[PDB]
Design a protein around this ligand. Sequence first.
Ligand SMILES: COC(=O)[C@@H](Cc1ccc(O)c(O)c1)NCc1c(COP(=O)(O)O)cnc(C)c1O
Ligand SMILES: COC(=O)[C@@H](Cc1ccc(O)c(O)c1)NCc1c(COP(=O)(O)O)cnc(C)c1O
Lengths: 480, 480
Amino acid sequence: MNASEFRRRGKEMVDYVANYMEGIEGRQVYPDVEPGYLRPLIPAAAPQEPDTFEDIINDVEKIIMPGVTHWHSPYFFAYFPTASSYPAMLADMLCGAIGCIGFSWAASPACTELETVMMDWLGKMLELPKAFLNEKAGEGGGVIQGSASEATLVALLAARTKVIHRLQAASPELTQAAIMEKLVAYSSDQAHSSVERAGLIGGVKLKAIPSDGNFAMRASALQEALERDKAAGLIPFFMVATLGTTTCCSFDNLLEVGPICNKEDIWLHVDAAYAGSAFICPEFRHLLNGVEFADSFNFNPHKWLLVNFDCSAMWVKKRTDLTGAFRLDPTYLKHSHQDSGLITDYRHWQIPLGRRFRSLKMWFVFRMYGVKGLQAYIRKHVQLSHEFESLVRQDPRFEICVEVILGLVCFRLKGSNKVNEALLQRINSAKKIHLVPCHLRDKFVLRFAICSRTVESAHVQRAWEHIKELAADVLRAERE
Amino acid sequence: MNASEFRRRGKEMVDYVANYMEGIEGRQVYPDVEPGYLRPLIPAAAPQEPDTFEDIINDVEKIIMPGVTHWHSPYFFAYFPTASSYPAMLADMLCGAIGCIGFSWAASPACTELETVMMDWLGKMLELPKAFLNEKAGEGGGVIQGSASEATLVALLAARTKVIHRLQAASPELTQAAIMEKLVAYSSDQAHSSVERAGLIGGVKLKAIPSDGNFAMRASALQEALERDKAAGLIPFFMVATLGTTTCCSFDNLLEVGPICNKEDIWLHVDAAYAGSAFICPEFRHLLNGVEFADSFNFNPHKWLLVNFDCSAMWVKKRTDLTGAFRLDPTYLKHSHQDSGLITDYRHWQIPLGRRFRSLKMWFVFRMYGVKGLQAYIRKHVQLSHEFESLVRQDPRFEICVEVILGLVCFRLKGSNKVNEALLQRINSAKKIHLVPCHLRDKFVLRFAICSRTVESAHVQRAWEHIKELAADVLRAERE
Ligand SMILES: COC(=O)[C@@H](Cc1ccc(O)c(O)c1)NCc1c(COP(=O)(O)O)cnc(C)c1O
Ligand SMILES: COC(=O)[C@@H](Cc1ccc(O)c(O)c1)NCc1c(COP(=O)(O)O)cnc(C)c1O
């Protein structure tokens, strides 16, 4: 295809995207397809001769769309929100056009330099401590990561490298493997699965700290675990404190855990993938207090800040902890400005080497929406979460398991876990709304998450009507 | 922004992208900016109120474009090509529109099911052994990875998990750390920096196998290294054989190394990031012979197959080696069809959890170009590489260090490394063309890579004229 053909087809794809978004409420949020639906509907081999764009866009509606779970339908209340903003889509078109692979500054200076300033913009929006900000002064800085799971793994690998060199400095004969056998990392019992995967990838032991009644990590439980493990020969090195847990959007206490991790020389990484976007609002910034004790902080703008996937923002106190570890400098990836402190090569900050101009999406979203526009988007979602909470609190057959703060409501029918599992099956079978469950201790709990950018008060009210209607049918069958 | 506004601005961005591509030859391939250029040109904080789209697109030309190294200019001959095709750009617009985070099949069935069939399409285009193909039969399958560096790390982590369980099965008292101390992996001395980073991340020792006169790994050198290391207590477990090396596009011998790795129970991963795209042409498929002995194979369609970054294709013989390792099954990521063999959850195949609908780009590129269209794109680039080779072979002042096969020419002025380093400095200072160097043993060697999709015979001829003119100036200064 040439450019003149892309002018026509590209503007047609713009119309198809806008039409799909304007009629997404007419779409069923969850598909009716069964596993293995797509392969019988398309040929087994690639076409030797070119197919037409009209046949491809027809196959999108006929084959692809039926097997699509619409994350951006207003009736999608599953997991956590994912970002869909038109400014980010416009920037992705320019990003693919420039087509730069910015592993180094020489690969494309604008790709690296725009990312560093955008991380300052975001850091100042969240009112982060100045130690995390690279304002052409200071040892800290930020980087776009592909995912919060990758950012957690990168933080663990940097902590593992630092503790190995410290222990080998004290005991030069100590081998790395013997250190690895005693290394232990910590997380909450409400932590995301990325923490355990990172520990399994890093070859280190991971232990879960018991949470309190509010499902938050406290200083007492951490001190009890450190007391047991250090007496057993284990060397704590890494800690993941979670703000806005996947289960119930609970918040670990950084003011209690932070100072403990600093005394114990434990690297403190803060995982606030979902809740981090709300910290640009001053009413929720108090939940971030204690990040000054953290060595690394990460949140996902591709969740609740309208910067389409992929975009994960990660700041560090000392860049040399990241740039010094896993450092390779091949001649084919060398340039003359590598030693300049004004810039950097983000390849050392990430597991991959290649990377794209993702900072254009942050630039576009921040400028076209503004800080006040993003703050209004956050507050409308939290207001809608409290509106769903009010409806549940008006029915004595239901109960709210955890305090509602930032767009997630954990609710359940009072009684067995079987009656709540039956209600979820009825909901997902009707396919009018989409919700996902969680397990708080031994309790089966349903989750209601405000996700879509176009969600309104009407959609939440209709979803509660659907849940209340199915609850009576399920509660009736329990009495028979 | 709403959809009606995106209709206008989106079609304007289509025009800007097409205009940039049609006038990319008027752009200087390498920027004249210095490090730290971008921060003084934009505000230090995000705008509280929204900025206009006209001011943003103006800042793209005024600020962003001067700091852009144009990978898709015909005069870009640096590193290796990166993919820029309009069909992939159209699919990326639809991918961001659907906005699915397909960590599971329930997240969006079409995202996972289309990817599995596209990997079969590609595998059959490369005429891969049927063991790597998931055609709803067999234990093998393919997955899109974010990068070849990530695919190499994933293969090493799966090999590390398998060797640990085998050794612990033979010796139940053996701890993992003691096994890690003896684990050693292997690669060529011409291997990419991703192999060493993967070994550093995996906490295992990595050793380089000496290459022959053609810079290829041979059975004799591998047997000598295995003989030394196994006598020293080291346990070989992982091997990365490279097809199309970053340095000189050399090809390791899989027919020699493969059977050795199978006897030694060494996981064999094949890294063919750049050269893998040419294997869809039957004249180059002989270079892939021996992949039948490999446990994993990876190549980058985001290099030489017009599928824009990111897209890395990785096949495996046994999916359970990947899906079994680092397996986590939280209730919030559970669905009812997880146990179906007709589908899968690609989250276990990758370091991250989230992923986007990247298989749309493979679908669009394969259908709009066709197999014959992609084969013609490969052969035109190889023809242009042989044309540059012919020009160098007509000048006795120059020499070709390695055989030219698949789009890369390694050349240098006969004599010192200082005269070739001076020639490269003159070339990159003139900014008319962009080339990068490499080191073959102790020899400084310049590289010429056919990169742009719009490159023609005229561009290569003008680049050789520029190199020949600067060579005489540099050779003159050496005699003074
Ligand atoms: C809530 O369910 C979880 O599995 C994820 C789902 C999810 C939601 C939205 C996006 O965009 C997404 O990528 C994943 N919320 C996850 C989560 C992660 C996972 O980070 P990445 O998906 O790897 O970026 C990490 N930490 C926390 C606290 C999470 O909730
Ligand atoms: C040739 O220089 C190398 O650093 C890379 C550069 C490069 C070129 C094009 C794209 O798209 C790119 O992402 C990187 N060629 C690299 C290379 C890799 C790196 O894989 P990823 O960049 O992580 O996908 C791996 N293996 C080989 C053999 C390479 O040549």
